[PDB]
């Protein structure tokens, strides 16, 4: 079952009837749900995805030029004109230049000079819009009471359901009920608005790297840009951002592009969010969610099982998690299942006074055959204790010490 | 133990779109880097794209940059390749392949996972012509092969488009001595094929023969029978 | 984009043969990630060598992989008929991509000549009912793959509706070929018989069939 | 002759004997040298070239990675080790990561994880040293004497000399004398140290664009770097400048490179000088020089030629230069050369009182044939004046007005 | 009116260096972009590099990036191509060509100057073998052609390396009826060539014929003679 | 990197023929700077067309230059024998570079047959004195360029020292070829005569010379 590895794990217990329980789901964190007379289940938000993201504007962060040309006119011989100063893809600059007898002109003074080149964008970054309608949340559920291989590994258990289940949530459909076969079902009313406002944020992509940025900063960027995308060939406005004109030759200037601004953008960006895009749909990691579970239709596997009377053995020795709980995997050699597993923690082996609670509510061996494996989770009390599993002489006990640190 | 099955191939209008799928079974899909590699008919292999085990990164060849998109769902053991703005150059057999991403053995992790397991591959034909259904005819054994030692009998699949077709025998319970010949590109442009089994002349009245033809592009699936000529 | 591999390599049985795989400092010379794959005609390629010199479980030790500078080499020692096939090399790239070579076709010299087996099939009654007629001539299990075809209409050549595939290699290193004659039932009936004759290294096999 | 087009033109007159005169030669500027009974000559520093420049240090301003790999060890199961964490070309990072039953490890806690990738530099900039031994200055000289086509055009016959001559100067050989055939010779004692101190400057090259930068700024650049030149393949120090490590998976991190820092450098670079490189040798434009001319062996073509008695005509109408001087092109149809050209400026046509000086010392028609071409330069006085050329009735006069505003 | 002469070609060891030169005459060199374009024997043309009129910029093909370097001296009307780290792949005829950069006509300036004027080009052979001098032998007219109308006579150039050789006649004062045949690549590896002039049988004893052979790689320049024979 | 030009184009005299020159949006489709050059065999290339459709002074108006999308076309109208030659296209690039095409060879159909003129020369006395001997057979002015050569030692074949050039086109659209026979003076004297015989379109010319 999920969560037992998770570090940001929240323990929550309901009441006796309960029916409803409030939870807080969050990326990188899980919620373990315990309840009196109800099976303990683990819930976790796995992904927060955006779809149908429409582009808005694209900026060019690396470009190059080609086909340089210039046209010059002597003093008092009218303005110069080059063919391509009306071409939307060419960038040009008009200027005056010193002319004399040396460079052909009959007089000395200022003459006209126009210089054009062809702008072409090698690498551009793209900004896209985020309307909260196109939001999808994936919430995964798993059930305490089955095996070990089905941990966070073997995430292929939805096809048999029972233990593991998925639910998908939308801001326009926050309700969702999830069936768990012989365990009943669970309803989920999840209020998403508490997450984060998307009315002033853009999804930025650049060289298969993604961010979330504020609108005003995006609009002010000093680079060539187009709306998009790209209607075959784009028309870049403000080509002078990356291009400039040097020199003052008799018959030409020199056009020159600025270096790739990829590093400059990367720099003034780390103070923002990150995202992925698998696939053609953005996947956020910076999320948040407040949900409400409806547990009336949740239930144990409805049999008063005859207790497991045969012998258990520890396959893996118990291990302390980061929260103090004890995990225990057991192999059972009996054939009297599906039986109720007798397991507790004793501070005294004579009276077997039940100290501490169980996290896996009512352990039951799913199979009826022998040599089956099952994992249980316990919440030990501070100090010394003994982990007792079984009945009679065929019970195994492991000494435990919970420092509580 | 390791099965990869492709799907989605067929005819597609030039300059259009198609989604190819690859289902996996019998191994931990979440640990294998997955590649698409294509091969034009009778040409060398061409690596198309890679996606890592977790989908963190994808990498494409220059020939398909900005046109194809590789992705995967690990919770389904499924791999998708979305090909957009297609061309005749992209008409080829597409193999979905997988290399395991583990080096030292549950300790290491490696990007250059090599190309271990290959699927059968699916054919993508980019032609403006339409799909044509095949015609299935039987070919009975000779009128002087009932009396002898061995005899030949077969199935003819006339005028279909496009490749590929597949032929089994007795629902797929007979492959010893079967020869499915390569098809012929007719001058008209349609393909035509034959598949012949050799048998002992003794078991003609005893054994019955049914060739199982399939041409999924047109979705035809005729299963003709062959009985001695009367 | 391409790794320069030789086109064909020819060796006699028993000999050792070597196959190029030349690249740049950004693929072959930059890493020890060059692999070698064997493809039999009409089958899925199979990984023979990976990481320059290591071979996977269940691969003959006749295949060895060397590399020097920017050029990797595949050596097939102890040549056998089983080695007649296509061989590709692949490599990781400084561009986080993979790249295959042109491919080399390995053919084993000195193989015994094999005579063609010809199966002739007349038009089925179904095809006759459909206003067309097709005579099927199937050549199989011959070597080398150089077969001439000829159609006779109880004498004289035949040109209309003659379609013939190119030689295609099959699993047992031999070759196969198909030839269809698409005629109308009137031509079929007017002539008394039809003869598919296949020439192969001088000798000419013949097969005849009639309306009967 | 040069300079007449040049805007930053300095006029300098010596004494009577003089022998030596100090001048300041500078890129984009000329010096006109006039003297009594000496031919007026034009001097200009054209190029300042550096050769044999030894590299010092190269910085990598755009890079990419390849062959990512990771190795992990369970809690208390020793440190992790990857093959290539000793390879000088790979960049690696060791770290601890959360491990539990979910990700294979028998216990919960920190486990070891090392991640390596192969660093490869796509684009690097190179800094080179400047020792004054490898310095070359080209100084061009021309003589006011005849012609017009030999302006800034036809720099082809300069090696046939007479009028045009080149000299090359080195800090290790600052002395240089230049012969001018029938005009004598000119000595040059040029002190280069005053030009520009090159003891705190590096020659920076980056993407076929070049600069001169301050040493301390060059040493401070925060990029991967290596000292020296190639050694086949380089070993980059401080690869972590462009590379960083994200994620904390059970079995790997993620390596990522920063964008091309070309734009950031371009930005924090414009505040320095610029240069070109034609070819395999640096060519500077930001220069300076103080020279001392020795004119004792300079002289007119030593004959008092019989004056040109035939008629002249103006081909080009006179033109005002940027400094007020007058250029005049004349065609001569007589055959009594090489003759002295009679030309002056008169404020009064009766007395022909010579007002204003001549810039072209002693105009002489070089040729003996007819229809010869010659250019003269005059320094007119303010107000009205008349440009008189010729003798008798067959002299042409052009009205001129130098407002001086 | 526009002359371009190449120089520097010859044999070069693989993985070495060679400097190719191009002199210009009869036009304003300072206004022409200058290109190097090479062609392998019996192959298509391959553009190598450009340098602009003023040398502001230079641009090279991908095949020679970081290996070749183009430059020019305008005060000499000269163009240099410095080839370093050579390979057999670079064995070809190198044409020095020049396009004028004037567009509008003394008004415009243009980068894409096109390829107007082409030089003869010089041959660069990248072989490890040495230069071998040729042997010049005469080929007299037949023993039954002295008495008649017309007869052929020629020169044989045996066993040389590498290409090219050149043959004139009468110091270059005879080209009407001259046929210089293409050389032959012998199995030994040396080239061999012939050059034959047809003449009228009348002027056999009167007119004299001297074939002028030159193989500048080896610096050979034998000028053999051929006279009629009644034998 | 390469411009895709066709390999050969064939037309009868008078006809109009068209030649490819396909590229990308970054060379042909990106600019109007594609040129066309004509190269005669063994001569300096000549500019026929520049800037897509413009021709320089002194070029026949039979050459026209079109361009559409990413593909430029050269049209030769009114085909003549003079147009038999190599034709290249070149183009400016978005990389501030130039690039040439593979080249197309234009051959004019229906040309009248030309019979070869063959001159044989025996080894000179100088060559004999130099310990070697070479018989020179020179074929010139024939069409088409398909000549077989054979050497006879006053009968019988000859195998030693037979070297023969490939056909080479000459200025007048005809072809020429050389063939040298390298013999020792002992072989020269032992046989009584020597015959160079050249076959060309059925007919085979012979030329003989002896020590005499």
Numbering used by the authors:
A (entry chain B), D (entry chain A): 1 to 405
B (entry chain H): 1 to 230
C (entry chain D), F (entry chain L): 2 to 213
E (entry chain C): 1 to 231
Please give the exact wording used by the authors of the publication that reports this structure.
Flaviviruses are positive-sense RNA viruses of approximately 50 nm in diameter with a lipid bilayer containing the envelope (E) and premembrane/membrane (prM/M) glycoproteins. The flavivirus E glycoprotein, essential for viral attachment and entry into host cells, is a major target of human antibodies. To better define the structural basis and mechanism of ZIKV neutralization by human antibodies, here we focused on human monoclonal antibody (mAb) G9E, which strongly neutralizes multiple ZIKV strains, but not dengue virus (DENV) and protects mice from a lethal ZIKV challenge. The ZIKV E/G9E Fab complex structure by X-ray crystallography and cryo-EM revealed that each Fab fragment cross-linked an E homodimer by binding to a quaternary structure epitope spanning the homodimer.
To define the footprint of G9E bound to ZIKV E protein, we expressed and purified the ectodomain of ZIKV E and the antigen binding (Fab) fragment of G9E. The ZIKV-E/G9E-Fab complex was purified by size exclusion chromatography, and the crystal structure of the complex was determined by molecular replacement. The resulting electron density map resolved the polypeptide chain and revealed the fine details of E protein interaction with G9E at 3.4 Å resolution. The crystallographic asymmetric unit contains a hetero-hexameric subunit formed by two G9E Fab fragments and one ZIKV E homodimer. Both Fabs exhibited a similar mode of binding to one E homodimer. Structural alignment between the two copies of the E proteins or the two copies of the heavy or light chains revealed that they are highly similar, judged by the low root mean square deviations (0.34–0.53 Å for equivalent Ca atoms). Thus, the ZIKV E protein in complex with G9E closely resembles the flat conformation observed in other soluble E protein structures but differs from the curved conformation of the E proteins observed on the mature virion. The G9E Fab footprint covers a buried surface area (BSA) of 988 Å2, of which 73% (709 Å2) comprises the majority of EDII of one E protein (Site 1). The remaining BSA is formed on the adjacent homodimer E protein involving the EDI N154 glycan loop and the EDI-EDII hinge region (Site 2).
